[PDB]
Short mmCIF file of N, CA and C in Angstrom, two decimals:
data_model
loop_
_atom_site.label_atom_id
_atom_site.label_comp_id
_atom_site.label_asym_id
_atom_site.label_seq_id
_atom_site.Cartn_x
_atom_site.Cartn_y
_atom_site.Cartn_z
N UNK A 1 1.17 -1.27 -0.22
CA UNK A 1 -0.01 -0.18 -0.19
C UNK A 1 1.12 1.10 0.11
N UNK A 2 0.62 2.62 0.64
CA UNK A 2 1.01 3.48 0.73
C UNK A 2 2.41 3.48 0.84
N UNK A 3 2.22 2.30 2.34
CA UNK A 3 3.92 3.21 3.42
C UNK A 3 5.12 1.88 2.68
N UNK A 4 4.57 0.91 1.13
CA UNK A 4 5.16 0.01 0.65
C UNK A 4 5.75 0.99 -0.18
N UNK A 5 4.94 1.64 -0.63
CA UNK A 5 5.28 2.41 -1.78
C UNK A 5 6.86 3.17 -1.57
N UNK A 6 6.36 4.29 -0.09
CA UNK A 6 7.07 5.30 0.00
C UNK A 6 7.96 5.03 0.09
N UNK A 7 8.36 3.35 1.21
CA UNK A 7 9.58 2.45 1.25
C UNK A 7 10.19 2.96 -0.21
N UNK A 8 9.44 1.92 -0.86
CA UNK A 8 10.23 1.53 -2.26
C UNK A 8 11.12 2.95 -2.99
N UNK A 9 10.14 4.14 -2.76
CA UNK A 9 10.50 5.12 -2.84
C UNK A 9 11.51 5.75 -2.52
N UNK A 10 11.89 5.98 -1.27
CA UNK A 10 12.86 6.15 -0.53
C UNK A 10 14.22 4.96 -0.36
N UNK A 11 13.91 3.82 -0.79
CA UNK A 11 15.38 2.67 -1.13
C UNK A 11 15.50 3.19 -2.62
N UNK A 12 14.65 3.28 -3.49
CA UNK A 12 15.26 3.77 -4.71
C UNK A 12 16.77 5.14 -5.14
N UNK A 13 15.69 6.68 -4.43
CA UNK A 13 16.25 7.52 -3.82
C UNK A 13 17.83 7.57 -3.39
N UNK A 14 17.84 6.96 -2.49
CA UNK A 14 18.92 6.52 -1.27
C UNK A 14 20.01 6.31 -2.57
N UNK A 15 19.48 4.88 -3.46
CA UNK A 15 20.78 4.70 -4.20
C UNK A 15 21.06 5.47 -4.58
N UNK A 16 20.10 6.24 -5.45
CA UNK A 16 20.71 6.91 -6.32
C UNK A 16 22.03 8.46 -5.83
N UNK A 17 21.26 8.15 -4.77
CA UNK A 17 21.69 9.72 -4.08
C UNK A 17 23.73 8.92 -3.61
N UNK A 18 23.50 7.54 -3.25
CA UNK A 18 24.97 7.02 -3.00
C UNK A 18 25.53 6.73 -3.76
N UNK A 19 25.33 6.87 -5.24
CA UNK A 19 26.26 6.77 -6.61
C UNK A 19 26.97 7.79 -6.38
N UNK A 20 25.43 8.98 -6.58
CA UNK A 20 26.14 10.55 -6.56
C UNK A 20 27.27 11.12 -5.69
N UNK A 21 27.01 10.69 -4.86
CA UNK A 21 27.64 11.08 -3.77
C UNK A 21 29.36 10.27 -3.92
N UNK A 22 29.20 9.17 -4.83
CA UNK A 22 30.71 8.54 -4.85
C UNK A 22 31.46 9.27 -6.09
N UNK A 23 30.52 9.55 -6.68
CA UNK A 23 31.15 10.23 -7.63
C UNK A 23 31.77 11.75 -7.91
N UNK A 24 31.21 12.18 -6.75
CA UNK A 24 31.56 13.59 -6.65
C UNK A 24 32.76 13.38 -5.51
N UNK A 25 32.86 12.85 -4.92
CA UNK A 25 33.86 12.08 -3.80
C UNK A 25 35.38 12.22 -4.94
N UNK A 26 35.08 11.00 -5.38
CA UNK A 26 36.43 11.16 -6.73
C UNK A 26 36.79 12.15 -7.09
N UNK A 27 35.90 12.46 -7.84
CA UNK A 27 36.29 13.93 -9.04
C UNK A 27 36.72 14.63 -8.05
N UNK A 28 35.96 15.43 -6.80
CA UNK A 28 36.69 16.18 -6.32
C UNK A 28 38.10 15.76 -5.39
N UNK A 29 38.58 14.70 -4.73
CA UNK A 29 39.83 13.85 -5.04
C UNK A 29 40.59 13.85 -6.01
N UNK A 30 40.10 13.73 -6.72
CA UNK A 30 41.39 13.97 -8.04
C UNK A 30 41.20 15.27 -8.50
N UNK A 31 40.26 16.52 -8.60
CA UNK A 31 40.54 17.64 -9.67
C UNK A 31 41.89 18.42 -8.23
N UNK A 32 41.51 18.11 -6.94
CA UNK A 32 42.29 18.70 -5.53
C UNK A 32 43.81 18.64 -6.11
N UNK A 33 44.25 17.28 -6.69
CA UNK A 33 45.16 17.27 -6.82
C UNK A 33 45.85 18.21 -7.66
N UNK A 34 45.66 17.89 -8.97
CA UNK A 34 45.90 18.79 -10.01
C UNK A 34 45.62 20.32 -9.57
N UNK A 35 45.16 20.87 -9.23
CA UNK A 35 45.20 22.29 -8.51
C UNK A 35 45.46 22.66 -7.94
N UNK A 36 46.29 22.10 -6.82
CA UNK A 36 47.17 22.27 -5.44
C UNK A 36 48.32 22.38 -6.22
N UNK A 37 48.81 21.08 -7.46
CA UNK A 37 50.48 21.31 -8.04
C UNK A 37 49.75 22.66 -8.74
N UNK A 38 48.99 23.05 -9.84
CA UNK A 38 49.37 23.86 -10.73
C UNK A 38 49.28 25.42 -9.68
N UNK A 39 48.49 25.31 -8.54
CA UNK A 39 49.21 26.78 -7.63
C UNK A 39 50.59 26.39 -7.13
N UNK A 40 51.36 25.60 -6.18
CA UNK A 40 52.35 25.23 -6.65
C UNK A 40 53.41 25.81 -7.30
N UNK A 41 53.00 25.70 -8.53
CA UNK A 41 53.71 25.80 -9.23
C UNK A 41 53.91 27.41 -9.41
N UNK A 42 53.13 27.85 -9.31
CA UNK A 42 52.97 29.32 -9.64
C UNK A 42 53.64 30.20 -8.67
N UNK A 43 53.35 29.67 -7.67
CA UNK A 43 53.80 29.72 -6.32
C UNK A 43 55.26 30.32 -6.40
N UNK A 44 56.19 29.06 -6.64
CA UNK A 44 57.58 28.64 -6.19
C UNK A 44 58.07 29.43 -8.04
N UNK A 45 57.43 30.30 -8.87
CA UNK A 45 57.46 30.45 -9.56
C UNK A 45 57.82 32.22 -9.18
N UNK A 46 57.18 32.88 -8.77
CA UNK A 46 56.22 34.42 -8.19
C UNK A 46 57.67 34.71 -6.89
N UNK B 1 0.48 5.84 13.11
CA UNK B 1 1.40 5.04 14.13
C UNK B 1 2.89 4.83 14.39
N UNK B 2 3.55 4.17 14.78
CA UNK B 2 4.99 4.12 15.06
C UNK B 2 6.01 3.51 14.13
N UNK B 3 5.32 3.03 12.71
CA UNK B 3 6.13 2.91 11.52
C UNK B 3 6.12 3.73 10.73
N UNK B 4 4.76 4.52 10.53
CA UNK B 4 4.49 5.27 9.15
C UNK B 4 5.38 6.54 10.16
N UNK B 5 5.15 6.81 10.88
CA UNK B 5 5.94 7.91 11.94
C UNK B 5 7.85 7.82 11.38
N UNK B 6 8.68 6.59 11.51
CA UNK B 6 9.85 6.75 10.82
C UNK B 6 9.94 6.54 9.60
N UNK B 7 8.55 5.72 9.00
CA UNK B 7 9.34 6.65 7.23
C UNK B 7 9.23 8.18 7.16
N UNK B 8 8.30 8.06 7.62
CA UNK B 8 8.30 9.96 7.57
C UNK B 8 9.70 10.83 7.83
N UNK B 9 10.25 10.21 9.00
CA UNK B 9 11.51 10.39 9.53
C UNK B 9 12.61 10.86 8.45
N UNK B 10 12.92 9.60 7.70
CA UNK B 10 13.44 8.80 6.45
C UNK B 10 13.56 9.68 4.86
N UNK B 11 12.21 10.29 5.12
CA UNK B 11 12.08 10.48 4.05
C UNK B 11 12.50 12.20 4.50
N UNK B 12 12.57 12.46 5.30
CA UNK B 12 12.57 13.95 5.89
C UNK B 12 14.51 14.06 5.74
N UNK B 13 15.11 13.13 6.45
CA UNK B 13 15.77 13.61 6.61
C UNK B 13 16.86 12.88 4.88
N UNK B 14 16.53 12.45 4.19
CA UNK B 14 16.56 12.19 2.90
C UNK B 14 16.68 13.44 2.10
N UNK B 15 15.07 13.98 2.03
CA UNK B 15 14.69 15.02 1.54
C UNK B 15 16.26 16.29 1.75
N UNK B 16 16.20 16.64 3.15
CA UNK B 16 17.39 17.41 3.59
C UNK B 16 18.55 16.72 2.97
N UNK B 17 19.17 15.95 2.83
CA UNK B 17 20.36 15.28 2.29
C UNK B 17 20.30 15.52 1.16
N UNK B 18 19.77 15.26 0.23
CA UNK B 18 19.25 15.41 -1.07
C UNK B 18 19.56 16.95 -1.61
N UNK B 19 18.98 18.40 -1.05
CA UNK B 19 19.04 19.66 -1.37
C UNK B 19 19.90 20.31 -0.94
N UNK B 20 20.71 19.49 0.33
CA UNK B 20 22.57 19.58 0.55
C UNK B 20 23.30 19.28 -0.20
N UNK B 21 23.12 17.78 -1.09
CA UNK B 21 23.81 17.63 -1.79
C UNK B 21 23.90 18.04 -3.46
N UNK B 22 22.85 18.40 -4.01
CA UNK B 22 22.71 19.43 -5.40
C UNK B 22 22.75 20.52 -5.25
N UNK B 23 23.23 21.26 -4.35
CA UNK B 23 23.92 22.43 -3.94
C UNK B 23 25.20 21.98 -3.88
N UNK B 24 25.63 21.34 -3.48
CA UNK B 24 27.43 21.37 -2.78
C UNK B 24 27.68 20.79 -4.81
N UNK B 25 26.93 19.83 -5.28
CA UNK B 25 27.85 19.92 -6.31
C UNK B 25 27.32 20.55 -7.32
N UNK B 26 26.59 21.83 -7.44
CA UNK B 26 26.27 22.76 -8.09
C UNK B 26 27.79 23.95 -8.28
N UNK B 27 27.22 24.01 -6.46
CA UNK B 27 28.94 24.70 -6.21
C UNK B 27 29.95 24.73 -6.26
N UNK B 28 30.65 23.04 -6.18
CA UNK B 28 31.70 22.55 -6.63
C UNK B 28 31.84 22.50 -8.11
N UNK B 29 30.75 22.78 -9.08
CA UNK B 29 30.85 22.50 -10.30
C UNK B 29 31.58 24.14 -10.68
N UNK B 30 30.34 24.74 -10.39
CA UNK B 30 30.71 26.25 -10.39
C UNK B 30 32.00 26.63 -10.20
N UNK B 31 33.08 26.32 -8.89
CA UNK B 31 34.15 27.10 -8.45
C UNK B 31 35.05 26.26 -9.45
N UNK B 32 34.91 25.37 -9.32
CA UNK B 32 36.31 24.40 -10.88
C UNK B 32 36.66 25.02 -11.88
N UNK B 33 35.10 25.70 -12.56
CA UNK B 33 35.33 26.40 -13.75
C UNK B 33 36.01 27.81 -13.54
N UNK B 34 35.34 28.68 -12.31
CA UNK B 34 36.13 29.63 -11.81
C UNK B 34 37.26 29.60 -11.82
N UNK B 35 37.69 28.45 -10.57
CA UNK B 35 39.78 28.30 -10.43
C UNK B 35 40.33 28.81 -11.33
N UNK B 36 39.96 27.51 -12.70
CA UNK B 36 40.39 26.58 -13.83
C UNK B 36 40.84 27.81 -14.31
N UNK B 37 39.83 28.46 -14.30
CA UNK B 37 40.34 29.74 -15.42
C UNK B 37 41.14 31.37 -14.68
N UNK B 38 41.09 31.25 -12.97
CA UNK B 38 42.33 32.49 -12.98
C UNK B 38 43.34 31.51 -12.60
N UNK B 39 43.45 30.15 -13.06
CA UNK B 39 44.71 29.67 -12.74
C UNK B 39 45.15 29.69 -14.18
N UNK B 40 44.52 29.69 -15.23
CA UNK B 40 44.59 29.95 -16.61
C UNK B 40 45.80 31.70 -16.69
N UNK B 41 44.78 32.46 -16.39
CA UNK B 41 45.35 33.74 -15.93
C UNK B 41 46.60 34.10 -15.53
N UNK B 42 47.14 33.19 -14.60
CA UNK B 42 47.99 33.29 -13.64
C UNK B 42 49.17 32.72 -14.97
N UNK B 43 48.91 31.92 -15.62
CA UNK B 43 50.06 30.80 -16.07
C UNK B 43 50.49 31.65 -17.21
N UNK B 44 50.01 32.48 -17.96
CA UNK B 44 49.63 33.54 -18.83
C UNK B 44 50.83 34.41 -18.07
N UNK B 45 50.37 35.45 -17.43
CA UNK B 45 50.75 36.28 -16.84
C UNK B 45 52.32 36.22 -16.49
N UNK B 46 52.47 34.93 -15.89
CA UNK B 46 54.08 34.26 -15.39
C UNK B 46 54.54 34.08 -16.86
N UNK C 1 8.72 -7.31 10.93
CA UNK C 1 8.10 -8.06 9.51
C UNK C 1 9.64 -7.38 8.21
N UNK C 2 9.55 -7.92 7.04
CA UNK C 2 10.31 -7.45 6.18
C UNK C 2 10.12 -5.75 5.75
N UNK C 3 8.93 -5.31 5.97
CA UNK C 3 8.95 -3.55 5.77
C UNK C 3 9.29 -3.20 6.74
N UNK C 4 9.67 -3.37 7.93
CA UNK C 4 9.87 -2.94 9.06
C UNK C 4 11.73 -3.27 8.65
N UNK C 5 11.78 -3.79 8.57
CA UNK C 5 13.34 -4.10 8.63
C UNK C 5 14.09 -4.06 7.51
N UNK C 6 13.30 -3.50 6.60
CA UNK C 6 13.99 -2.47 5.11
C UNK C 6 13.98 -0.84 5.67
N UNK C 7 13.04 -0.19 6.64
CA UNK C 7 12.74 0.61 6.88
C UNK C 7 14.25 0.88 8.46
N UNK C 8 14.63 -0.12 8.92
CA UNK C 8 15.84 -0.31 9.81
C UNK C 8 16.83 -0.17 8.92
N UNK C 9 17.32 -0.76 7.99
CA UNK C 9 18.39 -0.65 6.78
C UNK C 9 18.20 0.31 6.01
N UNK C 10 17.95 0.80 6.00
CA UNK C 10 18.00 2.45 4.89
C UNK C 10 18.30 3.22 5.98
N UNK C 11 17.23 3.71 7.38
CA UNK C 11 18.02 4.56 8.03
C UNK C 11 19.80 4.14 8.23
N UNK C 12 19.79 2.95 8.57
CA UNK C 12 21.35 3.02 9.58
C UNK C 12 22.37 3.00 7.38
N UNK C 13 21.95 3.13 6.47
CA UNK C 13 22.59 3.42 5.36
C UNK C 13 22.50 5.12 5.15
N UNK C 14 21.55 5.58 5.59
CA UNK C 14 21.35 7.23 5.14
C UNK C 14 22.39 7.19 6.21
N UNK C 15 22.52 7.33 7.79
CA UNK C 15 22.76 8.05 8.86
C UNK C 15 24.26 7.89 8.72
N UNK C 16 25.07 6.73 8.47
CA UNK C 16 26.32 6.33 7.03
C UNK C 16 26.66 7.77 6.37
N UNK C 17 25.76 7.55 5.56
CA UNK C 17 26.13 8.68 4.36
C UNK C 17 26.10 10.29 4.70
N UNK C 18 25.15 10.44 5.96
CA UNK C 18 24.83 11.91 6.02
C UNK C 18 26.05 12.25 6.88
N UNK C 19 27.29 11.26 7.79
CA UNK C 19 28.15 11.80 8.15
C UNK C 19 29.21 11.31 7.44
N UNK C 20 29.68 10.58 6.01
CA UNK C 20 30.25 11.04 5.39
C UNK C 20 30.15 12.53 4.08
N UNK C 21 28.47 12.28 3.94
CA UNK C 21 28.57 13.89 3.34
C UNK C 21 29.27 14.83 4.13
N UNK C 22 28.88 14.87 5.98
CA UNK C 22 29.53 16.08 6.31
C UNK C 22 30.48 16.52 6.70
N UNK C 23 30.75 15.14 6.39
CA UNK C 23 33.38 15.07 6.23
C UNK C 23 33.87 15.42 4.71
N UNK C 24 32.63 15.19 4.00
CA UNK C 24 33.13 16.06 2.59
C UNK C 24 33.28 17.44 2.76
N UNK C 25 31.66 17.79 3.16
CA UNK C 25 31.21 19.28 3.30
C UNK C 25 32.15 20.25 3.99
N UNK C 26 32.41 19.74 4.83
CA UNK C 26 33.56 20.43 6.00
C UNK C 26 34.83 20.80 4.90
N UNK C 27 36.00 19.59 5.31
CA UNK C 27 36.19 20.20 4.14
C UNK C 27 37.16 20.68 2.47
N UNK C 28 35.87 20.35 1.36
CA UNK C 28 35.24 21.04 0.57
C UNK C 28 35.30 22.65 1.32
N UNK C 29 34.42 22.76 2.15
CA UNK C 29 34.82 24.43 2.60
C UNK C 29 36.31 24.69 3.22
N UNK C 30 36.71 24.30 3.34
CA UNK C 30 37.87 24.85 4.64
C UNK C 30 39.23 24.70 3.10
N UNK C 31 39.10 23.31 1.85
CA UNK C 31 40.16 23.80 1.09
C UNK C 31 39.89 24.84 0.05
N UNK C 32 38.34 25.59 0.01
CA UNK C 32 38.42 26.28 -0.90
C UNK C 32 38.56 28.07 -0.79
N UNK C 33 38.53 27.91 0.90
CA UNK C 33 38.47 29.38 1.42
C UNK C 33 40.54 28.85 1.30
N UNK C 34 41.02 27.72 1.78
CA UNK C 34 42.59 28.53 1.58
C UNK C 34 42.86 28.79 0.03
N UNK C 35 42.58 28.07 -1.10
CA UNK C 35 42.45 28.15 -2.38
C UNK C 35 42.70 29.36 -3.16
N UNK C 36 41.09 29.85 -2.27
CA UNK C 36 41.15 31.64 -2.49
C UNK C 36 41.84 32.41 -2.15
N UNK C 37 42.68 31.97 -1.40
CA UNK C 37 43.57 32.59 -0.48
C UNK C 37 44.85 32.83 -1.03
N UNK C 38 45.16 31.55 -1.53
CA UNK C 38 46.37 31.50 -2.27
C UNK C 38 46.78 32.14 -3.51
N UNK C 39 45.26 31.92 -4.99
CA UNK C 39 44.85 32.49 -5.94
C UNK C 39 45.42 33.84 -6.04
N UNK C 40 44.67 34.39 -4.41
CA UNK C 40 44.22 36.08 -4.69
C UNK C 40 45.67 36.58 -3.87
N UNK C 41 46.77 35.84 -3.07
CA UNK C 41 48.18 36.31 -3.16
C UNK C 41 48.88 36.71 -4.44
N UNK C 42 48.92 35.18 -5.13
CA UNK C 42 49.57 35.73 -6.16
C UNK C 42 49.28 36.07 -7.78
N UNK C 43 47.15 36.73 -7.08
CA UNK C 43 47.36 37.71 -8.21
C UNK C 43 47.52 39.18 -7.82
N UNK C 44 47.26 39.60 -6.47
CA UNK C 44 48.48 40.38 -5.94
C UNK C 44 50.26 41.07 -6.49
N UNK C 45 50.90 39.52 -6.41
CA UNK C 45 51.57 39.15 -6.82
C UNK C 45 51.95 39.51 -8.66
N UNK C 46 51.12 39.22 -8.66
CA UNK C 46 51.52 39.32 -10.17
C UNK C 46 51.27 37.94 -11.02
#
């Protein structure tokens, strides 16, 4: 019924969010490396 | 009833986190662009 | 029953994600401040 439906909805929503969070964490960690590299380079230059 | 309320609280906590995650994602993507541009302009200036 | 048990599993998963997200958001904000400052120092210096 209504409750079983909402629980199913919540299940699928949480699954989606888990995947999107995993993507963001990984990209954030990856881009952060290159950004720090570029800043460090410029600072050693000036 | 008890279960209905646990499911309510679960839905409301999940909604809050989805909204928070959506904002962080958009901000991350936005600041990545700005910062990369600011870096490019410094790299050329040096 | 199976419904109450799915609800309890979802609650545990969400709580874990909430904590992981709080960790990510906090470090994102902190590193953003620092990156901005570094950029602005570099721009000041040319």
